Amino acid sequence: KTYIPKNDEQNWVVVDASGVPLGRLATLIASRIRGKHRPDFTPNMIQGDFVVVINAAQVALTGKKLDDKVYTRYTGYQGGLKTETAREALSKHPERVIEHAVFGMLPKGRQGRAMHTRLKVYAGETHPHSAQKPQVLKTQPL
Amino acid sequence: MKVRSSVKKMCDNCKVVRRHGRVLVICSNVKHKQRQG
Amino acid sequence: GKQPIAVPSGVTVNAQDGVFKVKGPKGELTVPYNTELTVRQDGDQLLVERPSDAQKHRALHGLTRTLVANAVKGVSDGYTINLELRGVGFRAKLTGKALEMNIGYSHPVIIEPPAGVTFAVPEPTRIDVSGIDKQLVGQVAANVRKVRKPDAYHGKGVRFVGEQIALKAGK
Amino acid sequence: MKGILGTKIGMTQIWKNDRAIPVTVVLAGPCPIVQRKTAQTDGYEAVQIGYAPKAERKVNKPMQGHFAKAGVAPTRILREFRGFAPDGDSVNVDIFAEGEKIDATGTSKGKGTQGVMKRWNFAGGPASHGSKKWHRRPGSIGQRKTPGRVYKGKRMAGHMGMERVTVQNLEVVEIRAGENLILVKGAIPGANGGLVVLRSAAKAS
RNA sequence: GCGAGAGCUAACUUCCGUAGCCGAGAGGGAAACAACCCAGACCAUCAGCUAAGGUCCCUAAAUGAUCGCUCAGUGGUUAA
RNA sequence: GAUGUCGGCUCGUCGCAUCCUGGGGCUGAAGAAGGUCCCAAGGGUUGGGCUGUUCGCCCAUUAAAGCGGCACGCGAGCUGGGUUCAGAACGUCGUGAGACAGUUCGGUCUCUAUCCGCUACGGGCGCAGGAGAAUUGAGGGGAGUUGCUCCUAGUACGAG
RNA sequence: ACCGCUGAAAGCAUCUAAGCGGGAAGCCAGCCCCAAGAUGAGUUCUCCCACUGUUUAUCAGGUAAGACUCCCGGAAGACC
Numbered sequence: 101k102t103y104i105p106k107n108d109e110q111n112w113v114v115v116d117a118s119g120v121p122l123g124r125l126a127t128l129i130a131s132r133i134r135g136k137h138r139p140d141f142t143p144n145m146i147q148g149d150f151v152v153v154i155n156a157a158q159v160a161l162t163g164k165k166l167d168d169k170v171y172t173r174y175t176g177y178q179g180g181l182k183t184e185t186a187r188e189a190l191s192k193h194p195e196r197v198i199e200h201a202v203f204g205m206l207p208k209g210r211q212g213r214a215m216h217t218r219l220k221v222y223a224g225e226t227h228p229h230s231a232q233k234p235q236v237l238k239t240q241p242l
Numbered sequence: 243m244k245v246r247s248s249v250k251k252m253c254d255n256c257k258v259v260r261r262h263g264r265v266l267v268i269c270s271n272v273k274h275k276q277r278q279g
Numbered sequence: 280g281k282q283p284i285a286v287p288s289g290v291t292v293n294a295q296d297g298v299f300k301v302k303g304p305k306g307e308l309t310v311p312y313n314t315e316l317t318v319r320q321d322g323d324q325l326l327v328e329r330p331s332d333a334q335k336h337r338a339l340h341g342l343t344r345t346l347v348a349n350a351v352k353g354v355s356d357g358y359t360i361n362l363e364l365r366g367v368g369f370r371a372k373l374t375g376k377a378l379e380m381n382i383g384y385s386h387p388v389i390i391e392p393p394a395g396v397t398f399a400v401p402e403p404t405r406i407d408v409s410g411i412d413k414q415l416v417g418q419v420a421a422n423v424r425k426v427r428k429p430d431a432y433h434g435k436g437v438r439f440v441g442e443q444i445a446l447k448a449g450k
Numbered sequence: 451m452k453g454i455l456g457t458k459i460g461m462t463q464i465w466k467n468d469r470a471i472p473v474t475v476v477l478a479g480p481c482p483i484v485q486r487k488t489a490q491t492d493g494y495e496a497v498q499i500g501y502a503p504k505a506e507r508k509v510n511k512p513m514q515g516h517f518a519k520a521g522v523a524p525t526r527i528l529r530e531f532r533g534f535a536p537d538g539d540s541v542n543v544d545i546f547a548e549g550e551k552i553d554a555t556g557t558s559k560g561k562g563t564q565g566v567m568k569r570w571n572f573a574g575g576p577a578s579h580g581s582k583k584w585h586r587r588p589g590s591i592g593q594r595k596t597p598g599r600v601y602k603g604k605r606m607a608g609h610m611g612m613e614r615v616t617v618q619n620l621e622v623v624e625i626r627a628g629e630n631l632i633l634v635k636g637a638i639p640g641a642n643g644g645l646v647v648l649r650s651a652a653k654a655s
Numbered sequence: 656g657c658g659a660g661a662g663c664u665a666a667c668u669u670c671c672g673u674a675g676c677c678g679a680g681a682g683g684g685a686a687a688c689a690a691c692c693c694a695g696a697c698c699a700u701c702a703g704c705u706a707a708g709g710u711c712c713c714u715a716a717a718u719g720a721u722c723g724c725u726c727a728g729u730g731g732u733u734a735a
Numbered sequence: 736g737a738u739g740u741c742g743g744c745u746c747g748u749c750g751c752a753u754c755c756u757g758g759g760g761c762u763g764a765a766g767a768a769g770g771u772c773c774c775a776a777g778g779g780u781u782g783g784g785c786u787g788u789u790c791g792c793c794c795a796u797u798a799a800a801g802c803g804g805c806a807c808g809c810g811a812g813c814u815g816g817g818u819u820c821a822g823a824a825c826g827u828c829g830u831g832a833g834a835c836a837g838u839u840c841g842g843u844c845u846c847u848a849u850c851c852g853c854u855a856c857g858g859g860c861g862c863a864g865g866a867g868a869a870u871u872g873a874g875g876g877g878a879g880u881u882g883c884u885c886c887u888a889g890u891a892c893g894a895g
Numbered sequence: 896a897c898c899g900c901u902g903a904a905a906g907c908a909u910c911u912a913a914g915c916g917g918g919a920a921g922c923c924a925g926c927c928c929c930a931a932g933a934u935g936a937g938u939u940c941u942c943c944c945a946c947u948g949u950u951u952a953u954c955a956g957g958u959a960a961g962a963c964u965c966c967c968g969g970a971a972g973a974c975c
């Protein structure tokens with residue numbers, strides 16, 4: 101008896117990372133990506149919005165950027181295949197720092213994995229208008 | 243470098259200045275150097 | 280406690296915003312400081328005012344005070360460190376703005392000054408490091424004293440013009 | 451940086467002063483410039499050079515156009531050389547000089563499937579004190595119940611050779627341009643009548 | 656758990672006393688997890704209130720309200 | 736209704752409480768040679784004689800000849816010298832049959848890999864037309880050792 | 896690790912609480928090799944060109960550029 105599905109609605113959203121503390125920005129994205137206000141509201145399928153992120157490079161981090169915040173990618177058979185970057189050390193690929201916080205707060209299933217396809221991260225400001233040919237409604241964090 | 247896990251005063255010259263997460267010493271006599279790591 | 284700041288002659292202090300820019304005759308200095316700590320002119324001279332009187336602010340009080348007191352001194356009086364070479368055949372020349380020292384090392388040592396500091400040699404056993412920024416002057420004369428520190432047996436190496444060196448003696 | 455394509459000709463004995471030098475005769479033939487790659491068009495800076503002449507009949511339409519766009523006349527081999535520009539069409543003259551240390555790279559003569567002894571050095575086993583595992587056979591592939599796995603990367607029997615090998619800092623002994631030849635001290639990888647790539651020393655000593 | 660002996664005031668040790676649960680106990684909680692916390696399943700419902708636990712996102716529900724403390728990632732390995 | 740057990744070999748990988756190299760602080764550190772502590776696991780860590788030996792002692796070297804984990808790592812990988820079957824002997828014990836804290840000589844180690852894992856090699860489909868070529872490098876792996884001699888300079892240092 | 900620069904709290908002093916520089920065979924890059932199944936499947940150059948087929952045959956069939964099959968071989972290779 102409860103309400104069924106409609107999909108012919110893909111909503112694009114622009115979110116700015118500038119000065120926002122990672123986890124707190126992550127929460128917002130991860131929530132709009134799954135379903136917060138939720139269109140049909142059902143969990144059986146992907147109802148969430150598409151989230152474009154700008155200024156990925158300027159995301160904020162508290163007591164540790166150079167310290168403690170350590171990404172820990174541990175490669176093929178561990179013939180000491182234990183690679184690790186610091187968070188300051190993500191002056192290499194900053195578009196990943198947002199990505200790994202967001203996927204981290206998303207379901208881990210078949211559908212869950214299909215969700216990262218909706219997160220588009222970019223390190224710049226006025227220039228990231230790449231994946232910005234469709235709609236691009238701007239949503240500020242809090 | 244004389245690593246004594248207990249840095250206490252020995253004479254009226256010793257100075258206990260807190261640095262990079264440890265109990266250090268900057269005394270007058272070079273032998274009197276005490277650190278906890 | 281630290282409060283009075285003497286601002287003589289041609290001083291152009293502009294503590295507007297977070298850019299507490301202090302201009303003068305010797306050269307124009309730029310130095311950033313805390314926003315939660317107040318600073319401007321409340322009379323003839325200068326004063327730094329702290330709001331909170333707990334512990335965290337008292338440390339930053341004496342910090343900001345002495346730092347502008349050093350930038351002001353720099354724009355009028357300036358700064359000059361006087362270093363003395365000690366030891367057999369230890370001598371320093373000059374190759375432009377570069378300090379060419381000969382201090383018992385197989386190949387001579389060359390030090391290039393940064394944009395704002397100047398090297399001087401009166402007698403070739405005396406080095407003068409003169410500049411605008413006390414930090415940079417300290418940080419530079421620091422590197423020269425490091426080329427050869429006074430050893431604990433014969434005091435040989437770079438020492439300050441009036442520096443005292445205790446001596447051990449082995450044999 | 452600087453570079454050329456050639457064909458390994460062979461090895462001989464030469465003398466310079468009184469010292470006998472083992473030389474590798476290489477034909478670093480003319481290499482027409484076939485495509486220039488710029489940051490503006492290709493996203494990076496490089497040059498596409500070509501090596502052995504191909505009969506026009508043997509060349510297909512897609513390759514005909516690509517060669518025609520530069521007015522070259524079909525090669526057969528096409529290689530890129532990064533951060534290399536010099537105008538015209540690449541030959542060894544002034545590209546290389548007698549004495550220059552170079553990095554000659556080829557494709558090692560392939561030796562098919564090879565046991566852990568030949569391929570990895572191994573040690574095999576006793577020829578006599580009671581075997582079954584006489585000479586080649588690796589030992590123990592792992593441990594016991596802990597890593598129920600065998601380590602990834604484990605040195606085992608496989609296809610040996612037929613690989614890219616860059617031999618560093620080879621000395622340039624002689625150069626006969628017009629004869630389009632270049633003598634190199636030592637041994638270059640790959641078999642005679644094979645493709646070699648002579649480049650300016652990757653990181654010279 | 657509590658009260659003792661044996662033991663090194665060891666053991667997921669042993670042996671008595673005592674209370675509970677598991678054994679023969681599903682359900683929620685404790686990431687997972689006989690035993691601990693809550694609670695004892697007659698069957699059906701696409702109704703409602705609670706318990707222990709919880710209320711950033713994975714993950715249900717306050718990114719609650721007030722006065723404080725701690726900047727060590729302590730919280731998220733013990734002692735002289 | 737079976738989880739093969741010492742030592743060798745083969746093959747590795749890991750910890751660091753570091754044997755050598757690397758960086759430091761203190762020294763009762765003049766110099767050269769060191770002592771001790773701190774940081775440091777990248778690579779390296781020799782060949783023999785004796786014993787089944789692990790160990791240990793010895794020879795000859797070395798920059799050094801590290802310590803420990805991985806079912807005292809590894810027998811569907813090899814050995815079978817040690818130990819634990821049946822034979823036989825010695826010493827001891829038992830009246831005996833026998834026994835061992837022992838010692839000694841002898842003594843069958845099972846052609847075919849299903850899944851996972853590992854090395855190599857293809858076939859398929861994908862990558863929004865069908866094709867022939869040239870590529871950027873997200874990522875991954877390999878490599879990583881060290882002596883002696885000379886120069887600086889018979890200089891700094893040392894009375895020598 | 897350790898050595899310093901400017902420097903308060905703590906009228907002095909202090910490499911540290913703000914900030915700064917130096918500093919290992921270690922870390923990240925550089926060297927050599929693999930690498931877009933990097934399903935996030937990328938880039939560039941060149942080619943072929945927009946056929947035909949009944950409400951019975953629902954997308955198959957001639958084709959282009961190109962390739963494959965087969966033959967003769969190979970410093971390629973178990974087969975491929």
Ligand SMILES: [Mg+2]
Binds near residue numbers: 573
């Ligand atoms: Mg052999």
Ligand SMILES: [Mg+2]
Binds near residue numbers: 734
């Ligand atoms: Mg206690």
Ligand SMILES: [Mg+2]
Binds near residue numbers: 740
């Ligand atoms: Mg056993």
Ligand SMILES: [Mg+2]
């Ligand atoms: Mg086994």
Ligand SMILES: [Mg+2]
Binds near residue numbers: 917
């Ligand atoms: Mg540095």
